[PDB]
Symmetry: D5
Subunit: 191 residues, 10 copies
Amino acid sequence: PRSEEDNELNLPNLAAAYSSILSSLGENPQRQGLLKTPWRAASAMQFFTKGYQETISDVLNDAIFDEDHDEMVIVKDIDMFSMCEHHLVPFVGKVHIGYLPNKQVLGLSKLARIVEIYSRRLQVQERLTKQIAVAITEALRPAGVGVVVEATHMCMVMRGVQKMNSKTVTSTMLGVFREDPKTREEFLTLI
Amino acid sequence: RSEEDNELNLPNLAAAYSSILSSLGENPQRQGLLKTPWRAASAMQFFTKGYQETISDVLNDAIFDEDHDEMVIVKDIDMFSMCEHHLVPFVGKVHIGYLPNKQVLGLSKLARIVEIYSRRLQVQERLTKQIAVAITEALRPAGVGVVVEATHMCMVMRGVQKMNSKTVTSTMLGVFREDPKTREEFLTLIR
Amino acid sequence: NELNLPNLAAAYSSILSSLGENPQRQGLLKTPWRAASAMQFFTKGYQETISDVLNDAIFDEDHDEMVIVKDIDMFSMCEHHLVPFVGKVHIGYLPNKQVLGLSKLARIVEIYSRRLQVQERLTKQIAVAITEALRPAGVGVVVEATHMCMVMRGVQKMNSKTVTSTMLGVFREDPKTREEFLTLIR
Amino acid sequence: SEEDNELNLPNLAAAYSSILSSLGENPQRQGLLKTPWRAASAMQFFTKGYQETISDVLNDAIFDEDHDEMVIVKDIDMFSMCEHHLVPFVGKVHIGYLPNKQVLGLSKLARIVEIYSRRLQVQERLTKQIAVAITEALRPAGVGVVVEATHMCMVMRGVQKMNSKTVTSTMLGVFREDPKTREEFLTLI
Amino acid sequence: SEEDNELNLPNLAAAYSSILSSLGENPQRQGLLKTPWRAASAMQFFTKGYQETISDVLNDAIFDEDHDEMVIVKDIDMFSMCEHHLVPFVGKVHIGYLPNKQVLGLSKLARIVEIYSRRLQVQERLTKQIAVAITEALRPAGVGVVVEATHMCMVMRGVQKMNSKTVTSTMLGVFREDPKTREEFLTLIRS
Amino acid sequence: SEEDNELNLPNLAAAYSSILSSLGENPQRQGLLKTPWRAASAMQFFTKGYQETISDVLNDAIFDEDHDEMVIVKDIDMFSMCEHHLVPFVGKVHIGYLPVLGLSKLARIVEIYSRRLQVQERLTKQIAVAITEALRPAGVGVVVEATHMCMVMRGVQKMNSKTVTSTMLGVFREDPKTREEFLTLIRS
Amino acid sequence: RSEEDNELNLPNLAAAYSSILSSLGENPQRQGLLKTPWRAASAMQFFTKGYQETISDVLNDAIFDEDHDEMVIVKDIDMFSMCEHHLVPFVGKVHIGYLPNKQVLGLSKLARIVEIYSRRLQVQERLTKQIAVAITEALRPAGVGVVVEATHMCMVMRGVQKMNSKTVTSTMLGVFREDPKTREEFLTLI
Amino acid sequence: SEEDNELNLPNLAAAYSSILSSLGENPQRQGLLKTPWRAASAMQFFTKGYQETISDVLNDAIFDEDHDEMVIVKDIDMFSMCEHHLVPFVGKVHIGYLPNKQVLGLSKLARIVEIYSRRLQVQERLTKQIAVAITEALRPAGVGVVVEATHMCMVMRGVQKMNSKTVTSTMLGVFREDPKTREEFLTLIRS
Amino acid sequence: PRSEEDNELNLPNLAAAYSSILSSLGENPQRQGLLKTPWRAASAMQFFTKGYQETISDVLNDAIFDEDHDEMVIVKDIDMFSMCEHHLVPFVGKVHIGYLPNKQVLGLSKLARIVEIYSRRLQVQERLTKQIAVAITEALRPAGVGVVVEATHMCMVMRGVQKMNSKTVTSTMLGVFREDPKTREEFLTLIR
Amino acid sequence: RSEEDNELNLPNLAAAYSSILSSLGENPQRQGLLKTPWRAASAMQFFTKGYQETISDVLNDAIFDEDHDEMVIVKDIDMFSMCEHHLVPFVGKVHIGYLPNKQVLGLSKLARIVEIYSRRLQVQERLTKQIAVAITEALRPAGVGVVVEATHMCMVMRGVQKMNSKTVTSTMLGVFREDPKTREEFLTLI
Ligand SMILES: Nc1nc2c(ccn2[C@@H]2O[C@H](COP(=O)(O)OP(=O)(O)OP(=O)(O)O)[C@@H](O)[C@H]2O)c(=O)[nH]1
Ligand SMILES: Nc1nc2c(ccn2[C@@H]2O[C@H](COP(=O)(O)OP(=O)(O)OP(=O)(O)O)[C@@H](O)[C@H]2O)c(=O)[nH]1
Ligand SMILES: Nc1nc2c(ccn2[C@@H]2O[C@H](COP(=O)(O)OP(=O)(O)OP(=O)(O)O)[C@@H](O)[C@H]2O)c(=O)[nH]1
Ligand SMILES: Nc1nc2c(ccn2[C@@H]2O[C@H](COP(=O)(O)OP(=O)(O)OP(=O)(O)O)[C@@H](O)[C@H]2O)c(=O)[nH]1
Ligand SMILES: [Zn+2]
Ligand SMILES: [Zn+2]
Ligand SMILES: [Zn+2]
Ligand SMILES: [Zn+2]
Ligand SMILES: [Zn+2]
Ligand SMILES: [Zn+2]
Ligand SMILES: [Zn+2]
Ligand SMILES: [Zn+2]
Ligand SMILES: [Zn+2]
Ligand SMILES: [Zn+2]
């Protein structure tokens, strides 16, 4: 995984590349508004890709509780901010997660923290959706998991096709959410 | 800026984007990243295409004599710009109003003037002033009012991480600045 | 109209051929005629006169307060590209004792909207027609429209809306009358 | 192609000038002077779709993401032209598909909409054409396309029904054969 | 009077039966058998305001509450009949008044609306009649009445404009003479 | 017919004049002077549908588009007249069918039956049967949602009450999944 | 109940309301409370007017032969009732659906049946069942579905004080009870 | 004051039992058995404001925060009883005040609403009482109170006007004398 | 169960701990705004945990009627205010309850009062949801019970993940609500 | 406040929270409460992190010369604070407007100034004033306007228990206070 030492070491290389981009765009990197931009853009890009340095074990912090619960738990409307790996422009939206506990429940915030491990990377929405579902499955081993991601890709609104209102909806269903249609429909209506 | 400048600077932009991918700990050779230095460079060139535009070419002599001396408004113009401090988008709406001096501007040219200045590395306050000044210079009307409302992704997906924050800026010239009733009317007609 | 119909159909058939289309296809067989009839309907306002439209609908109701007819659906044609511009018209007026038939305000909108237009002109024409037909203390007309030339083409700005207004008499000279009208139409 | 456009532009402008005269208008007045040309260029833009090929539009944007679950791109703004009256019909396209391991690049679904919407159309045909284009480009497990549109021919003339909306759909593969897949797509849009 | 209603009911039923025959319909079919009577009774109910007097409606509901501030009763559902085509016009009435120490019973404002709306009307007349009735019944510092209505003569026939709404108003006393009182009333009703 | 309309307009106007007098009103006052004729013309317009035939309305607008999937035209504004009280009932019509008819013809079929003295249940069935007879499709579904002014401005005086009626023919009646797909696609 | 019963019981109702005003520490002689024993008694008599009604008189023979065998719904019927436990209102909407057996009922008569039972001292569950049973007895249709959604003021301005709380009750008879597809179609259409 | 409730409870229950008999009901049926007592307790709760004093309610919650600017507590749910029919009238209270350096604890504005709303009322009186109680408890530069309510006497009986809402207001001090203060308060209370 | 004597005895222990918190945060417990805070915070925490002091029997008050009702009764949008047991920060939302009476019906307000027994405690949402459904099944013995809780956890919005719009939805289905899918879907659509 | 103060005071906060769990009648040894004294103490430190912040460090020299003399507004800034009277949150939105004196501030610094004062034990009126004064001192503009709209949980989940009540406070400095037209323009734009 990526480290804070890797971030400090790579920051001047990122700043050098951003300064080179400003010059290549016809801009003056010495004007007041651009003076600190190579560094602020480099730090922003490091923050946008901070998920690479995260591990599921550290994120969970042993937040698995024995609540004798065998019914669907949903955490919906998790704000998600990711980066398109094809154009390096953001894609933002919401993540809705549902799961069937096998007696043990995961701490509610850990579902949002798992979203943050994978969303803070250079992504493709389909991959991001699958990774979240698989992480929950491996961390807790529940009866089933369901993940739905709804996002606006800025590559499709401020450029290219320039379709203003287009939204991409992806889903990943594991266990009972995949095998039992009634579980799957209940999750989709509750979100 | 020119199209020759774009062709010449494209490989330098692609080189800097490839360097960024390596500095972030990513593999520039994986399927999803193979064409990214080029697609990211082309996207950044499109986002900064306003530098190569001139008001005269954009207007195309669209000034008509309609014996009109009353406020004309073009509201809800979708605007997509790039924060010059972090190189992350800031997007929103532009609302333009003007009092013609017998002659009217072609409706679309107001949105095209927005595109000259929004497709640049910007600060919202500057973008707002530039649009109002361009309209005043192109038409010489009794007055111009420009209101920009935008979401800065630098404030939502990083830093302060304030989800719902919106920045509202305005520039009032001529009668819109000197006459309070004119400014009061424009502001009500745009909501 | 009857004499012009075959000339319009001939021009529309010529357009179909110039676009690379087969004017003989089942779907395009009656298109030169349906397109010509549609364009005649879209421009029917040229053949209308204010006097015939009013039909003597002026009533003596001893009214000296603002009457508003808002949300009148308006469908016009951009004279620059020949593509529609559609929206709403909001009309207000201050009668001079005599009130006008409510539908006649919408019928005045139809005289000028069913023409090749520019929104600023259309707005002025409606206000002037009301002033000439009734001679009231004042008239106010607000038009809010979507120009398809700006949404399906050119700038391709999906949510842009154009707002125009024409204030005559008391609506122009008295700011309080003007602001009351603007709040009552929202 | 672009060569055909330049050659046919003066013939389109001549026909539009003829229309202005036949409507009782003055083609020499300020507002109408450039109209035969602007109207001809607009009609050529509205009919771009004819000169486009699926292969060029896709640009090899097919990625191996080991995905076998429904992908939806909804609320794609669509602007088309009624072939019966030559008046626009505008709305939204909602596309869903069940990939077979490989995923098409999201924008290419919106670009496929543009190939067939920028033509003289009938909504039912446009709906089928998008669904078929996706099936042919990707060969997925299934495709679902829903188009919801306002026909200006029904709002500004004829029946003059202001609020009427036409909803069409085309379901191929698993979207047609499996009722549960089809209902899931319809609720997610 | 109720004596006038009993006496005129068979004449109304005879005219409605005559209408059914003149429209090409069969007045003897099951659906139309009782229609001349049900239509006549409905028309008598729609015009019941003619048999009402302000004094009877008021029922001495004037209380001494030492109140000199604006009282508003808004969103009063109003159903009237167009006198030009005999088709309904329906909407809302918003009434405001500045008491002169004495306050009218809230329901009596709606009952005054019913005296004038249940008649063959013109919206401008109906608005004035309500304001004048309140001024005569109470003698307050001022009265304001705003009527917003959909005329079915404009939606299901003639111009056939579906969304058109007619807004009329009558301001008496302080509501007419003091602009600030008038604007306060207009903002408090636009809920 | 139009000759029937010219012959019956004076009688309608005399019956309306008689109504104005029987209500205690003055048919000689300015507001009422032209009302007998204008109310008569309005009632004729509201009952226009009886003079219309499906064949004339269709205008041969049947196209071969090789379509076997559901086509829906929803939110068609409908204005009808209650046959029990002669007061309007207004709302929306949502039509679905499995083929190809010209889209506007569905709204024109609504106008044939809505412009008559009606009962909502009858109006709904007539629209569905007219489409089935004109096209012979796999199935038709018609949903009418209306406000009856007889129930809001008089009688029970229930302000927000709405009546929903439906008619399902062919596959829309026999196949549960086709009817449930149509019912979800008409929700706006 | 009858109108003669209302004239006879009116002074006893007014006496009880006057007694309530005195027991609350109020002055029944002050301007605002002077006519209150009578206006409160008349209001309570109007709120309980459903006791003096009969299904047969309210239907007024409004049964038409329209050859209809498909679902008819009258939704959003405003309903105002009185809680029999605290004598405080419970108000909301009634949504009625039915599958005719060729014959249709007059639209307003469904709302009039709601008025027979809502204008009484009630419990929402009883009110819901009574409306469904009255329609079944008046029409004998294939099935009836009734859904009542109400705000009980006893739960918002007093007691538990949960002001967004809404009670939803339902009664399904015939095909609405036995056929799940009929039941779900009715619930989505309302 | 609490002793008055225990002493008067059997007299209230006797009057409610008498009402049940006079309505033609059986006071001995299961649903009506505890009703004379539950109705009496409910009426005592609805009129509990009579036993409250401003001094006890305030609990010395006056803080010195050097504040001289408008403080607003809007959307206070209010439940009162119509003194004419003994049927509820419910709505919202929006209070504004200009402090004279000292600020009242926010909750005490809602508690002042409860002193006067829990009584047999007239909306105009209730509005004035709240404003006068605040003016007396703090002696601020000015007070503004707006009450918006639905009278059940007007919806489930009498005029039977479903959507009618009564809006009353009381402005004291600067809120009454300064029009700009008054309009600022009225705009800030719109939600 | 907790008692009023327990509350009086522990109130000065709670104020002492709150006063200690004010000092440990670097604040001045003697400034005007903080002077009564140890007591007001202690009383508030006692109110937030009053459900421990309550028993189902006292709460019901014999409001179990004998109607002839065998159809679904729903009480939805019950405002619920609870306290996260992990951080001692509120979690607030709505509770929607549905049940199938076995002829006997419960008093409507008692469903909301059962919500109050368990929500006014240091909780976990999944536990709170189950306790409400189990209390209803034990008090009434109906054909089935369904409970849905939708809440905003302030630990998730004003700190930690800081996800502004995140909502947690939990459910507990007993009897016919668990075993019959049609009953379950009807309840879920009627609560929207 | 400092990071050393936080490390030193964390065990004292945990001790007080453990003492609160015992005083409420709870079992501090049960699974769900075992780490609570520490998680509650860390949460309270985070809620009060504003005490360790200085306007100078927060600004980071983000003052730009953009020749701007017109109103800049940053609205809908989500704000989370703590009631100093009950130690229960009060949350809402902050809307800030200012008239620059040629120099503009970095947009995010307005939200960061909100965070200095909201992350403390507060009173809404003080929070609003502190926010407007910090902007005036940092930039010296022509005027500043701050509006705070909040839900106090002390008033919704306890005490008066008024569900929908919202507190609106404002602070206007400079031209926002002295020019009524500037003040009204700001209030409509937010
Ligand atoms: N007036 C104005 N301000 C603008 C933009 C665009 C950006 N900015 C603002 O420039 C500042 C740069 O600050 P900095 O050097 O401290 O960076 P950094 O530590 O990464 O900051 P932060 O984001 O707080 O983490 C920020 O305050 C940012 O918001 C605009 O349009 N108008
Ligand atoms: N199925 C159906 N029913 C319809 C219409 C239109 C109307 N009706 C209903 O005929 C009944 C006639 O009753 P009646 O003779 O007793 O009239 P009247 O005393 O004035 O009654 P009311 O209105 O209660 O005061 C009413 O119930 C009315 O609603 C329709 O479309 N479909
Ligand atoms: N200003 C004011 N007025 C109020 C209340 C509360 C009630 N009222 C009004 O007292 C009047 C009592 O009249 P009355 O004697 O004629 O009764 P009744 O025949 O049953 O009447 P009605 O209702 O028409 O059937 C009504 O007008 C009612 O609205 C309030 O808060 N402020
Ligand atoms: N199923 C059903 N139940 C109904 C009504 C109407 C009321 N009720 C419920 O009877 C119960 C009475 O209990 P009780 O004797 O203890 O009274 P009281 O202490 O004042 O109660 P509370 O309000 O908690 O303070 C309450 O639960 C009430 O809501 C209905 O329509 N259906
Ligand atoms: Zn991209
Ligand atoms: Zn930035
Ligand atoms: Zn154009
Ligand atoms: Zn067409
Ligand atoms: Zn009319
Ligand atoms: Zn009727
Ligand atoms: Zn009750
Ligand atoms: Zn009353
Ligand atoms: Zn927590
Ligand atoms: Zn507090």
